[PDB]
């Protein structure tokens, strides 16, 4: 028996769930308030340069979950690509994340791995036993100079607060790699969709039982035309923000076009507070199998997220976490609806994780129909 | 009709020719003077640490030839591997090949790509119309400072000649990059066999029609027994070294074991002429997908190849080329033999070129059989 399903959101959560159920004969109506599919994964070609631009910022696919990998490889050709971030600070260019080259270069040393462990352990401020603040967990770990060169200015720009004002919980691990691997990611699978995420998600969306409507807001009154609703909009918004708006950072992108090769890599972080942007991305560097004479770039600014802005990074400190609980209690008393996604559950989720969660959510729903059981409102842990 | 074929050597040359013909029902006899297959591509595991060691030097597969790439993929699982060489000189660690990071670290700048073109154009001497020596190539494009830091000392050790005495082509090959790409090789296909080259070659050898006798020197009187001989041993040796030995450089690999990560990367170049070894290689890093606690490393020394040393790099100057001619003129007066490979033809050949050439030579013999025409001594250019 074919169910009627409303899915709010045409990003990965909406699409993957939609496709899983379309394949099992359900009638899937997917809507999105924006004027294009893809959610925050959307890319598109700038007309003047033909560069495939990541519209909502750099989106690097990476995963250790082969099921997910095989799954996207059904909808795109993945090109190999490894993210290699550079950072400009103190009149030098370094590689990130902090590795043996960063350390040698920064200190003008010629350390082996072990020698560099020793060198970092001397630099570490153990003149403080129970580090409380982010400022003091870094200072314990990597010492004043590195903390001040690579962390303090960046954190302030990205989070809008002094690392003294932030908790030690943020930095669980000593942020140094004691080898020369400068790949940003450790995952088994990494790459970039040859024709981009918009095409990949378009492919996922291509089934007879899926209808997409764009420029289309969710309205609660619609709920009753459907057997089930998957909502990948913001949890707070669903409830009229009745208890207040969940905290995010937002990003502004200042686009410019450079005629040539503007910086020579995909992402150049700027660690200094006195540089008002957080980083510059040169988008053509994400498609290295293509060549373009004209380059699209983005200066990236981080701000507090306000009512008219797109939300990016969830803040998830004590106030925001207490606020989320109140919305959770509302959600748990709900009936033909499941909340999913970065926005529906107030978490930061990579693409690969989002896809894994969407496949599972579909699976649970499908099993709910056959076993005659209630569909849960959340398919992952949310507390 | 099933021809009886003798092949001298079980490296790539021998293996691939053997396998192409076995598959055409020929009875192929492959001898090698060593007690194992693989030629200088041979890798094996160290007892103590279990690190897979590249016995005759680290061997990285790289090709723009899709056919060859497909070919070896029939016989091994190729893991992607990108070679990122570091270099120690002047109390610092740098990345090679020369790129934007190298230029910015060496001269203490934060240039954009265009600013780096300008900086290096002012350092080079565009008054040199046509660089003929290694030194001239370097002075023309990279300038005195980069030349002397990274190339002069290293080149003096590798070749045992002043760079004014060496051909420009040696340097001509290497990327001077004005972006942050530090991939040592341009080639589209680049990787390492998951199970190593010995297994890969084993598999090429593993046909019903192929018998392999190890610890077995070639003897001239065997020729009579076969319809054709493929010889991948040294050409001068085939002729009793009757005119002198072809000029080579040899390498001494000095092994040591470290409990930990010794340098943190596969290859560390030592560019100073006052450091005696040319490089240190840490072999576990060639298998990034494996984990090992102990590490096998090699300090690597270059010196003139003598009588009992293994030949690695052919010198190929006017003298060695005169000498080669003498051996060429004897080889041309042979009837049922084709000399192949780096040793058989006195050329430096990368694995992929070796294999393409083997593929071709096997093709040329099969073509010649059908058209009852004589099989030549060389299927490739050498005079
Ligand atoms: C700055 C940034 C960088 C990132 N970089 C990476 C990366 O490099 N690699 C990686 O793997 N992941 C990255 N991510 C995460 C990635 O963006 C997410 O995993 C992905 O967006 C999740 O897709 P989703 O569909 O669940 O949510 P979304 O993409 O956010 O889609 C939600 C959709 O629902 C729509 N919607 C919301 N409310 C309504 C409504 N009420 N009515 C109708 N439609 C509505 C929105 O228009 C939106 O399209 C990054 C995230 C951010 C913020
Ligand atoms: C230091 C070094 C590093 C290299 N690194 C790379 C690299 O990174 N990537 C790459 O693509 N290529 C590399 N190469 C080249 C690579 O080693 C060759 O492509 C490959 O070895 C060619 O194989 P072959 O079968 O033609 O010759 P070989 O591998 O030399 O095989 C010849 C075989 O013939 C046997 N033999 C010789 N004479 C006799 C005889 N009289 N009787 C019986 N047996 C005999 C030998 O025992 C040997 O096993 C490197 C080469 C060197 C020297
Ligand atoms: O730091 C360097 C590196 C290279 N060169 C010069 O450039 C030439 C060519 O260099 P390269 O591309 O490294 O070829 P080789 O050094 O001859 O080959 C070795 O080094 C390569 C880089 O890791 C490996 O792929 C090969 O297997 C190994 O034989 C050298 O002979 C040198 O004269 C330098 O002067 N300094
Ligand atoms: O090189 C670095 C690494 C991390 N961080 C800060 O640490 C936070 C989380 O650390 P991690 O555990 O995600 O690396 C990031 O948001 C950022 O504020 C930096 O400023 N510089």
Question: Are residue A126 and residue A256 in the same domain, yes or no?
Answer: yes
C-alpha A116: how far from its chain's center? Answer: 32
Structure tokens at A310: 């797109």
Structure tokens at A73: 């490889």
Question: What is the spatial distance between Cα A105 and Cα A91, in angstroms, rounded to a whole number?
Answer: 12
Is B177 designated active site? yes
Task: Examine residue A382 and state whether it is found in any structural domain, yes or no.
Answer: no
Question: Are residue B95 and residue B177 in the same domain, yes or no?
Answer: yes
- How many residues are present in chain B? 383
Measured CA distances, A21 to A25, A26, A286 (Å): 7, 6, 32
Question: What is the spatial distance between Cα B336 and Cα B339, in angstroms, rounded to a whole number?
Answer: 10
Question: Are residue A137 and residue A157 in the same domain, yes or no?
Answer: yes
Structure tokens at A270: 């700027």
Say if the Cβ atoms of B93 and A105 lie within 8 Å: yes
C-alpha A247: how far from its chain's center? Answer: 16
| Number of neighbouring beta carbons within 10 Å of residue B289 | 10
Question: Are residue A91 and residue A142 in the same domain, yes or no?
Answer: yes
CA angle at residue A30 from A29 to A33, to 5 degrees? Answer: 135
Question: What is the spatial distance between Cα B219 and Cα B226, in angstroms, rounded to a whole number?
Answer: 13
Q: Which of A279, A282, A298, A327 is catalytic?
A: A279
Contact status, residue B200 vs residue B189, Cβ threshold 8 Å:
no
Order the strands of the A337-339 sheet from edge to edge. Answer: A210-213, A27-31, A4-8, A228-231, A337-339
Name the residue of A94, A175, A315 to mutate for ligand 4: max ligand atoms within 8 A of Cβ: A175
Contacts of A1 (CB under 8 A, 6+ apart): A369
Q: Which residue matches tokens 């200072």?
A: A139
Contacts of B29 (CB under 8 A, 6+ apart): B4, B5, B6, B7, B211, B213, B226
Phi first, then psi: what are they for B105, rounded to 5°? -75, -45
Contacts of B146 (CB under 8 A, 6+ apart): B98, B106, B120, B123, B138
Contact status, residue A274 vs residue A306, Cβ threshold 8 Å:
no
Measured CA distances, B120 to A351, B65, B113, B137, B176 (Å): 41, 33, 11, 14, 10
Q: Which of A125, A165, A309, A350 is catalytic?
A: A350
Task: Examine residue A94 and state whether it is found in any structural domain, yes or no.
Answer: yes
Where on the phi/psi map is residue B157: left (φ > 0), alpha (ψ -120 to 50), or beta? alpha
Give the resolution to one decimal, in Å. 2.5
CATH of residue B321: 3.40.50.720
Measured CA distances, B301 to A26, B273, B311 (Å): 69, 12, 13
Structure tokens at B69: 């790439």
Q: Which of A287, A267, A262 is nearest to A279 (CA)?
A: A267
Phi first, then psi: what are they for B272, rounded to 5°? -75, 135
**Which 3-state string (H, E, C) describes chain A?**
CCCEEEEECCCHHHHHHHHHHHCCCCEEEEECCCCCCCHHHCEEECCCCCCEEECCCCCCEEECCHHHHHHHHCCCCEEECCCCEEEEECCEEEEECCCHHHHHHHHCCCCCHHHHHHHHHHHCCCCCCCCCEHHHHHHHHHHHHHHHHHHHHHHHHHHCCCCCCCEHHHCCCCCCCCCCCCCCCCCCEEEEECCHHHHHHHHHHCCCCEEEECCCCCCHHHHHHCCEEEECCCHHHHCCCCCCCCCEEEEEEEEEEEECCCCCCCEEEECCCCCCCCEEEEHHHHCCCCCCCEEEEEEEEEEECCCCCCCCEECCCHHHHHHHHHHHHHHCCCCCEEECHHHHCCCCCCHHHHHHHHHHHHHHHHHHHHCCCCCCCCCCCCC
Q: Check the annotation: does B312 bind a ligand.
A: no
Cis preceding-peptide flag for B53 (omega within 30 of 0): no
Partner A contacted by B84 (CB < 8 A):
yes
Question: What is the spatial distance between Cα A208 and Cα A147, in angstroms, rounded to a whole number?
Answer: 54
Order the strands of the B86-89 sheet from edge to edge. Answer: B92-95, B86-89, B267-270, B279-282, B294-304, B248-259, B313-314
End-to-end CA distance of chain B: 34
Is A334 designated active site? no
C-alpha A362: how far from its chain's center? Answer: 22
Q: Which residue matches tokens 């590798």?
A: B158
Task: Examine residue A273 and state whether it is found in any structural domain, yes or no.
Answer: yes
Question: Are residue A210 and residue A358 in the same domain, yes or no?
Answer: yes
Measured CA distances, A351 to A69, A204, B36 (Å): 11, 14, 48
Cis preceding-peptide flag for A167 (omega within 30 of 0): no
C-alpha B66: how far from its chain's center? Answer: 19
Task: Examine residue A344 and state whether it is found in any structural domain, yes or no.
Answer: yes
Question: Across the strands, what pairs with A268?
Answer: A86, A280
Which residue's CA is minimally distant from atom 17 of ligand 1?
A: A40
Domain containing B191 equals 1-82+185-247+317-372
Contacts of A256 (CB under 8 A, 6+ apart): A296, A297, A298, A299
Order the strands of the B4-8 sheet from edge to edge. Answer: B210-213, B27-31, B4-8, B228-231, B337-339
Which residue's CA is minimally distant from atom 13 of ligand 2?
A: B350
Q: What is the largest CA-CA distance in chain A?
A: 69
Residue ending a domain, choose from B280, B300, B316 = B316
Question: Are residue B65 and residue B127 in the same domain, yes or no?
Answer: no
| Number of neighbouring beta carbons within 10 Å of residue B88 | 19
Question: What is the spatial distance between Cα B31 and Cα B215, in angstroms, rounded to a whole number?
Answer: 8
Name residues contacting ligand 1 (CB within 6 A).
A 8-14, 31-34, 39-41, 57-61, 217-218, 232-233, 312-313, 341-343, 349-352, 354
Phi first, then psi: what are they for B93, rounded to 5°? -105, 130
Determine the distance separating the centroid of ligand 3 and the alpha carbon of B222, expressed in angstroms: 40
Which atom number of ligand 4 is nearest to the Cα of residue A154?
Answer: 20
Question: What is the spatial distance between Cα A303 and Cα A368, in angstroms, rounded to a whole number?
Answer: 42
The dihedral sign for the CA sequence B102, B104, B108, B114 = positive
Question: What is the spatial distance between Cα A342 and Cα A13, in angstroms, rounded to a whole number?
Answer: 9
**Which 3-state string (H, E, C) describes chain B?**
CCCEEEEECCCHHHHHHHHHHHCCCCEEEEECCCCCCCHHHCEEECCCCCCEEECCCCCCEEECCHHHHHHHHCCCCEEECCCCCEEEECCEEEECCCCHHHHHHHCCCCCCHHHHHHHHHHHCCCCCCCCCEHHHHHHHHCCHHHHHHHHHHHHHHHHCCCHHHCECHHHHCCCCCCCCCCCCCCCCEEEEECCHHHHHHHHHHCCCCEEEECCCCCCHHHHHHCCEEEECCCHHHHCCCCCCCCCEEEEEEEEEEEECCCCCCCEEEECCCCCCCCEEEEHHHHCCCCCCCEEEEEEEEEEECCCCCCCCEECCCHHHHHHHHHHHHHHHCCCCEEECHHHHHCCCCCHHHHHHHHHHHHHHHHHHHHCCCCCCCCCCCCC
Question: Are residue A24 and residue A87 in the same domain, yes or no?
Answer: no
Contact status, residue A255 vs residue A297, Cβ threshold 8 Å:
yes
Q: Which of B202, B224, B214 is nearest to B4 (CA)?
A: B224
Measured CA distances, B153 to A114, A208, B160 (Å): 28, 67, 10
Q: Which of A18, A20, A1 is nearest to A10 (CA)?
A: A18
Question: What is the spatial distance between Cα B110 and Cα B197, in angstroms, rounded to a whole number?
Answer: 42
Q: Which of A32, A35, A34 is nearest to A18 (CA)?
A: A32
Q: Which of B371, B367, B22 is nearest to B379 (CA)?
A: B367
Question: What is the spatial distance between Cα A81 and Cα B181, in angstroms, rounded to a whole number?
Answer: 12
Structure tokens at A92: 């030098």
Question: What is the spatial distance between Cα B351 and Cα B343, in angstroms, rounded to a whole number?
Answer: 13
Question: Are residue A62 and residue A8 in the same domain, yes or no?
Answer: yes
Question: Are residue B3 and residue B74 in the same domain, yes or no?
Answer: yes
Task: Examine residue B383 and state whether it is found in any structural domain, yes or no.
Answer: no
Question: Are residue B260 and residue B310 in the same domain, yes or no?
Answer: yes
Q: Within 13 A of A180's CA, how many CA atoms are on the CB side?
A: 28
Task: Examine residue B380 and state whether it is found in any structural domain, yes or no.
Answer: no
Q: Which of A177, A172, A151 is nearest to A162 (CA)?
A: A151
Partner B contacted by A293 (CB < 8 A):
no
| Number of neighbouring beta carbons within 10 Å of residue B332 | 11
Contact status, residue B54 vs residue B81, Cβ threshold 8 Å:
no
Task: Examine residue B378 and state whether it is found in any structural domain, yes or no.
Answer: no
Question: What is the spatial distance between Cα B313 and Cα B327, in angstroms, rounded to a whole number?
Answer: 18
Structure tokens at A232: 């990948």
As for how many domains chain A has, the answer is 2
Phi first, then psi: what are they for B266, rounded to 5°? -65, -40
Question: What is the spatial distance between Cα B172 and Cα B170, in angstroms, rounded to a whole number?
Answer: 6
Question: What is the spatial distance between Cα B29 and Cα B31, in angstroms, rounded to a whole number?
Answer: 7
Strands B43-45 and B86-89: unpaired
Question: What is the spatial distance between Cα B317 and Cα A318, in angstroms, rounded to a whole number?
Answer: 74
Measured CA distances, B43 to A192, A290, B297 (Å): 33, 36, 14
Measured CA distances, A239 to A231, A236, A243, A245, A347 (Å): 12, 5, 8, 10, 17
Question: What is the spatial distance between Cα A241 and Cα A233, in angstroms, rounded to a whole number?
Answer: 12
Question: What is the spatial distance between Cα B40 and Cα B335, in angstroms, rounded to a whole number?
Answer: 28
Q: What is the largest CA-CA distance in chain B?
A: 70
* Method used to determine the 3D structure: X-ray
Structure tokens at A74: 């059904």
Question: Are residue B228 and residue B355 in the same domain, yes or no?
Answer: yes
Structure tokens at B292: 């090992």
Measured CA distances, A128 to A121, A133, A138, A139, B184 (Å): 14, 11, 11, 9, 44
Identify the residue among A96, A100, A264 best suited for mutation to test binding to B, counting B beta carbons within 10 A and taking the highest. Answer: A264
Question: Are residue A202 and residue A328 in the same domain, yes or no?
Answer: yes
Partner A contacted by B275 (CB < 8 A):
no
Question: What is the spatial distance between Cα A107 and Cα A345, in angstroms, rounded to a whole number?
Answer: 43
Q: Which residue matches tokens 């606020």?
A: A323
Contact status, residue B161 vs residue B303, Cβ threshold 8 Å:
no
Structure tokens at A129: 């036993």
Q: Is A272 exposed, middle or buried (0-12, 13-18, 19+ CB in 10 A)?
A: middle
Any ligand 2 atom below 6 A from CB of B34: yes
Question: What is the spatial distance between Cα A170 and Cα A186, in angstroms, rounded to a whole number?
Answer: 19
Is A245 designated active site? no
Question: What is the spatial distance between Cα B102 and Cα B108, in angstroms, rounded to a whole number?
Answer: 10
Any ligand 2 atom below 6 A from CB of B341: yes
Question: What is the spatial distance between Cα B38 and Cα B202, in angstroms, rounded to a whole number?
Answer: 8
Task: Examine residue B312 and state whether it is found in any structural domain, yes or no.
Answer: yes
End-to-end CA distance of chain A: 34
Contact status, residue B355 vs residue B247, Cβ threshold 8 Å:
no
Q: Check the annotation: does B59 bind a ligand.
A: yes
Q: Which residue matches tokens 């990059």?
A: B177
């Amino acid at each position: 028996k074919s169910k009627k399903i409303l899915i709010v959101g045409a990003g990965f959560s909406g699409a993957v769930i939609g496709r899983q159920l379309a394949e099992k004969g359900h009638q899937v109506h997917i809507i999105d308030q924006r004027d294009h599919i893809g959610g925050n994964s959307y890319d598109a070609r700038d007309s003047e340069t033909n560069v495939m631009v990541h519209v909502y910022g750099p989106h690097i696919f990476h995963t250790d979950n082969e099921t997910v990998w095989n799954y996207i490889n059904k909808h795109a050709e993945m090109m190999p690509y490894v993210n290699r971030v550079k950072a400009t600070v103190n009149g030098q260019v370094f590689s990130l994340p902090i590795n043996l080259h960063t350390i040698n270069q920064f200190f003008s040393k010629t350390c082996s791995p072990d020698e560099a462990r020793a060198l970092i352990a001397e630099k570490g401020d153990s003149t403080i036993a129970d580090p409380q603040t982010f400022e003091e967990q870094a200072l314990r770990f990597i010492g004043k100079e590195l903390y001040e060169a690579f962390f303090k200015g960046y954190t302030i720009k990205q989070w809008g607060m002094q690392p003294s004002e932030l908790p030690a919980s943020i930095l669980k691990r000593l942020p140094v790699r004691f080898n020369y691997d400068d790949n940003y990611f450790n995952h088994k699978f990494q790459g970039m969709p040859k024709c981009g995420y918009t095409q990949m998600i378009k492919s996922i969306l291509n089934h007879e039982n899926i209808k997409v409507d764009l420029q289309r807001e969710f309205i609660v009154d619609e709920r009753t035309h459907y057997d089930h609703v998957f909502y990948s909009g913001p949890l707070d918004a669903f409830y009229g923000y009745q208890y207040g708006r969940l905290g995010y950072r937002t990003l502004d992108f200042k686009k410019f076009i450079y005629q040539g090769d503007y910086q020579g890599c995909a992402v150049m972080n700027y660690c200094s507070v006195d540089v008002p942007y957080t980083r510059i991305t040169e988008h053509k560097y994400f498609s290295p199998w293509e060549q373009h004479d004209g380059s699209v770039c983005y200066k990236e600014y981080s701000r507090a997220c306000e009512e008219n802005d797109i939300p990016y990074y969830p803040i998830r400190q004590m106030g925001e976490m207490a606020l989320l609980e109140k919305y959770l209690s509302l959600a748990e008393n709900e009936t033909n609806i499941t909340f999913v996604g970065r926005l529906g559950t107030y978490r930061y989720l990579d693409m690969d994780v989002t896809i894994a969660e969407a496949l599972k959510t579909a699976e649970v729903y499908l099993n709910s129909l056959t076993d005659n059981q209630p569909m849960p409102v959340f398919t992952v842990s949310v507390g």
